[PDB]
Chain length 498, copies 4
Amino acid sequence: VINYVEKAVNKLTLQMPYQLFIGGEFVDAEGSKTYNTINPTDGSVICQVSLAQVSDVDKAVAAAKEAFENGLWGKINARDRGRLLYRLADVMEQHQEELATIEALDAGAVYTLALKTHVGMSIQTFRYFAGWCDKIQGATIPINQARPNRNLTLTKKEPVGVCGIVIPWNYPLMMLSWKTAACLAAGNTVVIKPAQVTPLTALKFAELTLKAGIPKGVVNILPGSGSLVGQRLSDHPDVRKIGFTGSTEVGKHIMKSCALSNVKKVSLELGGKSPLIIFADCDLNKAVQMGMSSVFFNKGENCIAAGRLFVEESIHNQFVQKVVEEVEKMKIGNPLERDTNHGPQNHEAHLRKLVEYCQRGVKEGATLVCGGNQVPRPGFFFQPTVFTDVEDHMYIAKEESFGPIMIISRFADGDVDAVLSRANATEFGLASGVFTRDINKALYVSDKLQAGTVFINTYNKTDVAAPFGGFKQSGFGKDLGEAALNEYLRIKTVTFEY
Amino acid sequence: VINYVEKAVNKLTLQMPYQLFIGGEFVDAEGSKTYNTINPTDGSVICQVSLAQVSDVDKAVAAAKEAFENGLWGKINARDRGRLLYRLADVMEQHQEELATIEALDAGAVYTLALKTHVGMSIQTFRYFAGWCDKIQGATIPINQARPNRNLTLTKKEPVGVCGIVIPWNYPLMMLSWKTAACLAAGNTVVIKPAQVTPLTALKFAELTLKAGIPKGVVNILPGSGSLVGQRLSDHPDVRKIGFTGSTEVGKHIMKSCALSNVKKVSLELGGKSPLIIFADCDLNKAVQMGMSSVFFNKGENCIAAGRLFVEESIHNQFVQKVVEEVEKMKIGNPLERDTNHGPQNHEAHLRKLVEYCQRGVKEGATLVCGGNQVPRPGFFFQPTVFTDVEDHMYIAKEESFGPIMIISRFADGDVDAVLSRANATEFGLASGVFTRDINKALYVSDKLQAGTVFINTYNKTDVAAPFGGFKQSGFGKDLGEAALNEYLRIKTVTFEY
Amino acid sequence: VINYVEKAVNKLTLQMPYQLFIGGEFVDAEGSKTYNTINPTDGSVICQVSLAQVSDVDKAVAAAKEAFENGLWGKINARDRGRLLYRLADVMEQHQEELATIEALDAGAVYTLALKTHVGMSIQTFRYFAGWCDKIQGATIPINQARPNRNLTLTKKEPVGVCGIVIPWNYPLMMLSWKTAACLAAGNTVVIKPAQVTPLTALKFAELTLKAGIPKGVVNILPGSGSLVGQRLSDHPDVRKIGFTGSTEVGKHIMKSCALSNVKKVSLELGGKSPLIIFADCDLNKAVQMGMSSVFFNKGENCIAAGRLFVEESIHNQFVQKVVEEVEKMKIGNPLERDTNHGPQNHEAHLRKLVEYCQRGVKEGATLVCGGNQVPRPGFFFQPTVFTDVEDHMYIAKEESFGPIMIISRFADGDVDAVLSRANATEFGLASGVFTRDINKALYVSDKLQAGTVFINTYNKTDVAAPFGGFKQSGFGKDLGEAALNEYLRIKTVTFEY
Amino acid sequence: VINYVEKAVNKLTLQMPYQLFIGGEFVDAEGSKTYNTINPTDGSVICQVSLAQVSDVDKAVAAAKEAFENGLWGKINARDRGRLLYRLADVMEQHQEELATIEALDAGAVYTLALKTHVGMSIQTFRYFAGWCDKIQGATIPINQARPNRNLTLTKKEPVGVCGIVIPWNYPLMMLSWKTAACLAAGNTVVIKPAQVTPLTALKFAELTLKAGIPKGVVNILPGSGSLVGQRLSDHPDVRKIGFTGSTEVGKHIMKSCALSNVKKVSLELGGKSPLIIFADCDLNKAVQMGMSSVFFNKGENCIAAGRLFVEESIHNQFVQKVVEEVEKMKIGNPLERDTNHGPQNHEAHLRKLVEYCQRGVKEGATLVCGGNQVPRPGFFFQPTVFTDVEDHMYIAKEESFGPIMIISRFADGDVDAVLSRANATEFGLASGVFTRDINKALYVSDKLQAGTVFINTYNKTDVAAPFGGFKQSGFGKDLGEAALNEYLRIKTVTFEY
Ligand SMILES: NC(=O)c1ccc[n+]([C@@H]2O[C@H](COP(=O)([O-])OP(=O)(O)OC[C@H]3O[C@@H](n4cnc5c(N)ncnc54)[C@H](OP(=O)(O)O)[C@@H]3O)[C@@H](O)[C@H]2O)c1
Ligand SMILES: [Mg+2]
Ligand SMILES: [Mg+2]
Ligand SMILES: [Mg+2]
Ligand SMILES: [Mg+2]
């Protein structure tokens, strides 16, 4: 029997595990330490959650090591590993409403969005990677022959072993799923550290791995702090790979920690200040819709959000007028209400950061067209915000807000290389976008943009088959697509003489 | 007109550049600083070589950055980049006897071996990778369609940009060539730091890039210290990738330095303590030949050298007797003499380490069968060495010698998993081997060995098409083969809606 | 509602469709023509089955064309096409006992074997290929640039369109499933012609496509004759690809018909006379078990069956003794008896061919060790048979029996190239095997065998991920594995200038 | 010493072999039979060329068989095969002016174009495929394990063996090189049948294989008739693959012949009636230039030539006006004259077809704007032709001219699907094109076009890395790119149990 926090909400009964998940069981942390997880809609405590300690990290890593080396997971056919992962996706689908409701409570995710995206894309992720298991293939290579003898050279793709996954709070289940599905499909075992502020869907997911028959110790989940739990994962001698999504500063520290312990492999999905270039020859009404989505999607808590919009001079004023008209129509409210389309920010400290961010924007001379303030209601709601007259030297032109803040600059009619230079003048390089009907401009701009993803006449169009990752200080390595698997596999070269 | 150190040796007149190579020209280091490079055959000074300073690193990086961003290398077709690399290989082949002679002088490489391997394989590497240029391909991906609209998702493989390559002294030209060929084939530009003790073939290679018509600034070479030049490369804000081969401890420091600066990509080819398991059902005389090669090849200065031989009890004594017979036939001498089998160690400090290494092996109780000492003659020669009765707890069972020291342990007749456990009981995982006529043992053993390469009934059989790289604390990423290209490329995802 | 033949058998009430399946409906053939399908266990008529006419082929092709061009199948996401194929596999699994019972009745497949192989592998096939749908990818290619302009070249993998699949009677559901799964995974629509003698699992499968929600007209099934129905498929102007499995001579005729009509694509999986080479250094008792399986599996009605065993002189007589001992332990009987090892042959004409085949072998001078005739009992049972003293010029050394007839020749101790020559002296090239503990022999022999599949120390080890196809007059193209997809896809090159 | 036809022309002394090339030597045909090859500039006999007989085909195939099975080509490293192919390309480059002059004489190729395309692209082809030799790789596949035992499955890519290549006359050396480069890169040996009317560059190429060190019997060349020499190649029991480029009707017969003999593999590059759709929003002057090229390149003797131009109503009249202006600037003359940009048609019988073609176009009611006739001068020159008011039912809207005949239809402004239907209403599907500045229209039209190549805002942009082949009755299989290799390789699956 598992201990649950039970809650009647959104026409169902939530049964939320709140403990550490280690070696297939829910257990208290060392000293039965706990912390509170906070509902961003009203600021209330949802429940107490176990607070993992160093010795809990060591127990989780040991369980994952044992599951990998001696348990069933390291012994079953790749095809049968695939079947378990497909069954896990099915179990997630069976609990889709519950998962989306937990995400709404824990992260402020608008329920209809959480169903489609946070949860829906997570289900797709597991199904996609389940199909890879028995399709991961090595090679045979026509090497020079040691005549008069013969040689055969092949490669074997093998799992890396025990992995640690450390993730942020913006899409709790979805970030977990992106990384965990690739990690498990490759035959690894894993210890996951969800963001401290958003533990709940990760813990429910953990229970779902039991319903799906994932062998004990294959998945271990440790709610707790990055400075304690995430640090120990990066330091651990039995951990062989870290997959990390989060800020550039923490990413630097993770990579350093991997080096200093045992040169464990690392992948980094870091910040972004992604440019969206909107040309005068675009479909303007569609540009408004997609440009708004590029910023405001999931209350701006979106790693690939456009952190900068460059709008061609001749359409700039009309674009801004139309954005303001649409912003006024947005319904801000409880994420569980079906008419809501703008939920609360994830947690209080982040709301504070956004308020301060917009103060700095105003202070430095940018024009606040709308928003900029907390919404006067319970919880941590922030107004969808538009800045214009943004100049390249400005703080808000350089720093990632991670909030619903549209940051608009003009560029001269007929400029292309000049706007590209400005769009590329960042140490980030996660995503980017261009709206234009001109094929030649679209293709040229996509070539020249220094970003891991370039959207053309769309935005936020991720897909489980399409690799996602940054350039420059946005990191390296891919989540999603075949490419993601390479972070979780090692290649053994075997060379025979006969 | 280039300044050379001219030397008449080996029936040739060598013309050796000795300066820094920056932006297509040989130039003195800042303050005209120099150091001596030492011939290991007699301990003499070959010549003075420029000693690169931090400002020289900055100049090299600036030249590499300009060559990539604005120079011809970044504008030519992939096919034509390929042609230039194939021309470079032809120029290397035209200069092959000279390059091999320089390597004999600088590294103590036996001339006949240097022709075939140090230089021969370097030529193969550039020809192999030249072939990849116009065969590096991205993907088109069947993503979910945003109905009633359509989507197209493709990926583009792009160069990473400015790279730094840092290499060791055991195969100076060959290590340079492995990493440099892959780096340039992927469209990058490069700053290379050869090991301070072995700069000469790198600098002659620099001149050959001019003869081949490689655009100025594409290749820059900086003889000098790792703690100055290599460090600045790892720290530099304009360098986007480091490719490193060397020790595990320096690798840790490089990875840390990559993290703390700009999260530049890193790949690491580190040390090894590679096991070779010899079963009683092997071809014994072949096992003796290949077993000796596994240790003694290139005077043991060989990152994949077998650092432990486990020999089945019933053949152990006969194997050792046969090895001693063959060891006594090895001809030690000047690398330029055609009858030489065993050249001098690379430099004096390494010879000293080898002497100390074998003192400790004797102290801790292993049986010294032969060698263990500096050869009484000028230069830095070391006697091919055989230890037996080696136990798992011993220093020489754990530490990489990087010299011609065969380190033998027994295992009980029939004891497959037990010997595997002992072979895998290391934090290294670079290479490994198994000698057996039994197909079932060979396949099982190669599955169970925790190493990036497994040789079966052979050893030292590398090939430019076969990826080479370690597991665990031997690092990550591959040199050679298609897989090497992935360290030098980035993937851009481009997603259209229409 | 669908009309069924109902049969209370094997603890089940079978519900067997017996009509043509066209455009998602079970329909009578033109003029309500029918034929009898015969139970090989007792020679009884199972039921009457619709006999497709030319006008029925035209209707099926028209339904497939409409389904491809205008129906849902041509519009849904690849991922969602995958979901439907997964669901079809689940539906087949839910009906697995019924399908295996139908196969026992219709083909004489031993029920326990039919569950595991005929049906179980069919389920694996659909699940495997379902995973490929959204992982079928094209390329982006670094072509030469039309300077001062730019070029982008990509490829798109597209379905071929309407396909015809023509199959034999030995594994009715499995052969259908192999080809159909790959065909549908690639986005095509299909008209299937099962062998006239074995229509029933194909028709039950058709019904299962309805339960799975496969759109109308995507799958059409036409029981009837090859010379009428199969011919019209190969001739049809709207069919773009034929996938064929059967005899070399029909294959030739099919390929000719494809040529003369509209040069539709063709793949051919034809006969075999597959050699199994058994060396004296093999594990003898395992060689007997696997050697017997290589011949007797599925009553020898197995395209990859070993049609000759070459057994090394020193073990030949012991091998034959052990085979005879084991043959005598085989239980012959009703496919539904749970201890049956050897079921009846598929139909009466095939039994008669096997009697004649063995008369011919004795006449021409081979030694009949055991078997060679019909088992006296109702139905069409043939004795497991062993021939020795088989010489290379003999009819039975050249002709495929497609029955449970082990055909043994000696080869000389210590010869390898000579036995290889004999094993390769056939115009077939489908499969082959080698039993030896010697790694060098195993690898050399696998290089030298002229056959699409080589088994090493096993036999009949097919796998849905491992491509299966012949060389020489065994045909071309693969079933199973990623390679199977290529027969069902076309490549469009799209080249932009911008 | 080789017998040459010597010719002082184009400031060169041509040395042209004229005999069969068999087993590394130039030899007379059976009975010393010969035929005349005709210069299309003036109708004169260039020289007599050996006329291959059936016994000569058998000698060629025997030489290819021996070279493959026992000669050096079947024994060397893939890497060294690559080196030989690279060397071949270098030799071709050393003879480029001579090859281009021979092609001008034999095929009427304008010298400047023959240098850049006929010859230049052939050189690129051999270099490109030389790079593939040691990069052709098989797989290791994670199959289900026969527990308690283990399984390893790998694939080996092997050569198909002796190949026959049959090619047309429009780009004699280039069509030879496309197919031969891929064939040889895959490790095969070859018998080549050039078009009877254009034997000379093939025979010179044969001599260049000697200069390059290609082993005897690897390349064999048989000038002669399709109905005799080509037929015997397709029939031969020792030929295992035919690569064919030519008409759909000869393709059908070749494929039938492959079927009826030994089911040899076949690829077919057949005719085309390729549509070019020109939208009103295109760059009109560039559309004229590229539209001109699409039709008139290489005097229309171009398999991918646009066979119909569909021009949007609102720009149609202006397009035609601009085309006529450009047509009038074309200089018709001797291909060796530097100012010539329109050479003669290849041979007399082709000229006669073009004359009849345009008579029929006029008869059926199309508007003949200009040309349509043989130019009054010696040789076989044809006036660049423009037809307008072409309706879909007309012969010239359906049938491939293969001459310099622009065939223009209108479509209504704003129609997209309607013009696509018309463009796709053909049994051909080789190439196609769209000109438009609208990204959405370009991507949609490229999806919907039923052709193996789609050009966007360009035409005739082939590349050695970009696969080229037809759909429907334009055949199957690719020349060029990685995909071409698949026609010349077979896959062997090797499955171990251990
Ligand atoms: N898809 C492509 O890549 C491509 C490229 C270029 C051209 N083509 C097509 O080629 C056609 C123009 O050439 P064409 O009309 O001269 O071609 P064709 O009549 O089909 O001849 C092509 C080749 O086939 C040979 N041939 C004739 N009968 C044969 C037989 N029974 N068995 C074996 N070979 C036989 C011919 O020999 P002879 O010398 O005796 O005629 C010639 O060498 C056009 O339709 C064009 O589109 C296609
Ligand atoms: Mg934070
Ligand atoms: Mg050192
Ligand atoms: Mg039959
Ligand atoms: Mg013709």
